[PDB]
Design a protein around this ligand. Structure first.
Ligand code: CLA
Ligand code: CLA
Ligand code: CLA
Ligand code: CLA
Ligand code: CLA
Ligand code: CLA
Ligand code: CLA
Ligand code: A86
Ligand code: A86
Ligand code: LMU
Ligand code: LMU
Lengths: 160, 163
């Protein structure tokens, strides 16, 4: 089992013997989970850093509370002086609906578990020979470094 | 056109023709959605009455926030923090997506006619519970927005022996 994911210095990095028995479906689901975790980690990086910078959208979220009035960090969602639970629940429901009605495979692009073409693409037809492998390695490495950095940021703001 | 869930109180009840032609898959999805909304409504109706007389003494937020103090009805969503709602939604999603905390011994081995009648009764009870939940929510919201409006006092206007 040597595929995209052991790029850079060390090779098969399985100190715990995770893939001692192994199987194809377990392989695919683990890769999909790692990819999703990394993607959400880097998007949360963008959001957290751009909020710590000082930028804020105009307008109000609740009945008389602007986007720049909420605290920054963990206190936004939980703790005193947080966003109204109705608004947060509504946003969570909207995100769930978008996830369940947008990023599913309704055509049959298949290939890798995580591709949601459904006909729409920019240039993922002309390039073929080897850009796919190193691109996937790039996205995986970025996701892993993301997850590490975002866990560090969350713990730092918790202990800060 | 003709499947489970057609009983004589009326008979077809499709005035606006929401189905018309459709297909087998779309009809099956609609039936699944109706069964799901119905079961959820029945659970909601059952759970809207129990806390009025019984209360589990657990401290949602250890140290404070003890069930024994949170309001009942549509006012609990404001008192309960976002973390608990997220945790329970994730838990029910784990129940639904996976087979976790689910047992196939509840499918039973009933004959065909018994199964059909039981399914029809399930759908009827659920259809009733939907409107039950609607009325409960409307009364609670109207009373909370303006106390004294709709002068019938207390939650659950029926079952007056609770108070
Ligand atoms: C209404 C909202 C909604 C809905 C319906 C879904 C629906 C789904 N999500 Mg999802 N998600 C949402 C919002 C939503 N999401 C939000 C807002 C986020 C954050 C951005 C995520 C992040 C997310 C990830 C990362 C993953 C999903 C996955 C899934 C799928 C399976 C979920 C599952 O098995 O249950 C949940 C089952 C579990 C076992 C939960 C795991 C919880 C982990 C193990 C613990 C995490 C640590 C904890 C949060 C903090 C600990 C604190 C410390 C003090 C201990 C399903 C389609 C999974 C998927 O696509 O599967 C292929 C997946 O990997 N979601
Ligand atoms: C939760 C996120 C997550 C997930 C699901 C995975 C999943 C995986 N990683 Mg991985 N990784 C992650 C985060 C994650 N990684 C991060 C943040 C880093 C940077 C420190 C790495 C660095 C890394 C290396 C260097 C390698 C892997 C490899 C692997 C694969 C085989 C090892 C295994 O079974 O791990 C399962 C992991 C878990 C069950 C998580 C532990 C949860 C405990 C209980 C808490 C597997 C698909 C190997 C691979 O793909 O080789 C081809 C490999 O060589 N990972
Ligand atoms: C994990 C992802 C994630 C989550 C949970 C949130 C959640 C939140 N963001 Mg946020 N944000 C994100 C990604 C995310 N954002 C990204 C990627 C960016 C960069 C464009 C921003 C830029 C941003 C700004 C500039 C502001 C927020 C604000 C907020 C808060 C209120 C507005 C709202 O409902 O969402 C807002 C949703 C978006 C901006 C959509 C982002 C693009 C999506 C993820 C694609 C809310 C807690 C506001 C706030 O009150 O600050 C705390 C605010 O002023 N966010
Ligand atoms: C993580 C949580 C989670 C996840 C992944 C799902 C996933 C799903 N739900 Mg669901 N649901 C949940 C929590 C969750 N539910 C909760 C907490 C409730 C309240 C009781 C419901 C009530 C509910 C209803 C009433 C229906 C679904 C339906 C669905 C399916 C399609 C959703 C759709 O079309 O877009 C949104 C899908 C399998 C629909 C379905 O399967 O029928 C087509 C449907 O009709 N759900
Ligand atoms: C729509 C459904 C629904 C919702 C949203 C809520 C929401 C809430 N309930 Mg509640 N409840 C429900 C149904 C529901 N309940 C039902 C059906 C009952 C009767 C058993 C109760 C009895 C009840 C009590 C006694 C208390 C609450 C409380 C609460 C609040 C705190 C959260 C909590 O502990 O939940 C608890 C939610 C449940 C216990 C419902 C679980 C129902 C699942 C489906 C059972 C699954 C099967 C079970 C594990 C056994 C399996 C065996 C097999 C044969 C099936 C919260 C607002 C507490 C509070 O302070 O309220 C003010 C409290 O003390 N509820
Ligand atoms: C060993 C497992 C474990 C552990 C360590 C915890 C730990 C905790 N739970 Mg908890 N819980 C568990 C299992 C566990 N839970 C299970 C199995 C259930 C049944 C569903 C619940 C139901 C539950 C409720 C109903 C509540 C808690 C709350 C809490 C927190 C107590 C107050 C606090 O610290 O506020 C600090 C809280 C935070 C810093 C915010 C934490 C946000 C959570 C961890 C994110 C969860 C994300 C979700 C799992 C996955 C993503 C969303 C999904 C849709 C994809 C604490 C973090 C309370 C709480 O969160 O109050 C605030 C609360 O009301 N729990
Ligand atoms: C939030 C928690 C939760 C939820 C929503 C579910 C949901 C479900 N469980 Mg379940 N379960 C859970 C936790 C949960 N489980 C846990 C913690 C256990 C113990 C390990 C079980 C053990 C269990 C068994 C053994 C069985 C289920 C079954 C079921 C299904 C039917 C439940 C039903 O009709 O009775 C819900 C009835 C009520 C809520 C009425 C309460 C009556 C009150 C209390 C009288 C007073 C459903 C998918 C059954 C199934 O899938 O069969 C098809 C089944 O056989 N569950
Ligand atoms: C339509 O939909 O559009 C197209 C739009 C567009 C733009 C083309 C698209 C995009 C592509 C995108 C968004 C690509 C994004 C890539 C992204 C977001 C990559 C992040 C990496 C983050 C890293 C490596 C963080 C490391 C963090 C590390 C290593 C840390 O530990 C950091 C730090 O943390 C601590 C521990 C503490 C601080 O004291 C100190 C340091 C800082 C040491 C999309 C979806 O294709 C959509
Ligand atoms: C084998 C195993 O392991 O488990 C098995 C066990 C078993 C039993 C075999 C199985 C099953 C089937 C199940 C789960 C059956 C349960 C069915 C259930 C519990 C169905 C509730 C109906 C509630 C209704 C109709 C409420 C109407 C409420 C109405 C009409 C109201 O008017 C409400 C009301 O509020 C108003 C609006 C005004 C108020 O002022 C007055 C009141 C309060 C009255 C499973 C699934 O196979 C699993
Ligand atoms: C939300 C996501 C960010 C969008 C940026 C601004 C939108 C939020 O604020 C937006 O609220 C309403 C939405 O139409 C509009 O305006 C509304 O809110 C204003 C500010 O509370 C008030 O005058 C009124 O409630 C209403 O007129 C304006 O367009 C803008 O004030
Ligand atoms: C979602 C499914 C809900 C089903 C949950 C299972 C219910 C069965 C047991 C729940 C009873 C919980 O309440 C039980 O434990 C509580 C733990 O806070 C304890 O409650 C008591 O102790 C707490 C912690 O020491 C203190 O806040 C108080 O002294 C008091 O609330 C009691 O021992 C008992 O009231």
């Amino acid at each position: 089992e040597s595929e995209i994911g052991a790029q850079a210095p060390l090779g098969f990095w399985d100190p715990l013997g995770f893939l001692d028995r192994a199987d194809q479906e377990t392989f695919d689901r683990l890769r999909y989970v790692e990819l999703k975790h990394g993607r959400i980690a880097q998007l949360a990086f963008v959001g957290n850093l751009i909020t710590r910078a000082g930028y804020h959208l105009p307008g109000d979220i609740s009945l008389g509370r602007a986007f720049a009035d909420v605290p920054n960090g963990i206190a936004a969602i939980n703790g005193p002086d947080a966003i109204s639970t109705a608004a947060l629940l509504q946003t969570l429901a909207f995100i769930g609906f978008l996830e369940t009605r947008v990023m599913i495979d309704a055509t049959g692009e298949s290939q890798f578990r995580g591709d949601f073409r459904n006909g729409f693409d920019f240039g993922w037809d002309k390039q073929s020979p080897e850009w796919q492998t190193n691109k996937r390695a790039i996205e995986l490495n970025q996701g892993r470094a993301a997850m590490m950095g975002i866990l560090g940021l969350m713990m730092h703001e918790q202990v800060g | 056109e003709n499947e489970i869930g057609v009983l004589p109180p009326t008979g077809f009840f499709d005035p606006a023709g929401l189905s018309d032609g459709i297909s087998q898959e779309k009809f099956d999805s609609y039936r699944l959605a109706e069964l799901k909304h119905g079961r959820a409504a029945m659970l909601a109706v059952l759970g809207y009455v129990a806390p009025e007389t019984y209360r589990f003494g657990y401290d949602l937020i250890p140290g404070e926030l003890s069930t024994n103090d949170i309001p009942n009805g549509v006012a609990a969503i404001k008192a309960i923090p976002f973390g608990g709602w997220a945790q329970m939604i994730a838990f029910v999603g784990c129940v639904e997506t996976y087979g976790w905390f689910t047992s196939p011994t509840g499918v039973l081995d009933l004959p065909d006619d018994i199964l059909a009648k039981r399914q029809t009764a399930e759908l009827q009870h659920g259809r009733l519970a939907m409107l039950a939940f609607l009325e409960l929510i409307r009364h609670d919201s109207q009373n909370l927005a303006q106390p004294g409006f709709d002068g019938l006092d207390n939650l659950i206007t029926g079952l007056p022996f609770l108070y």
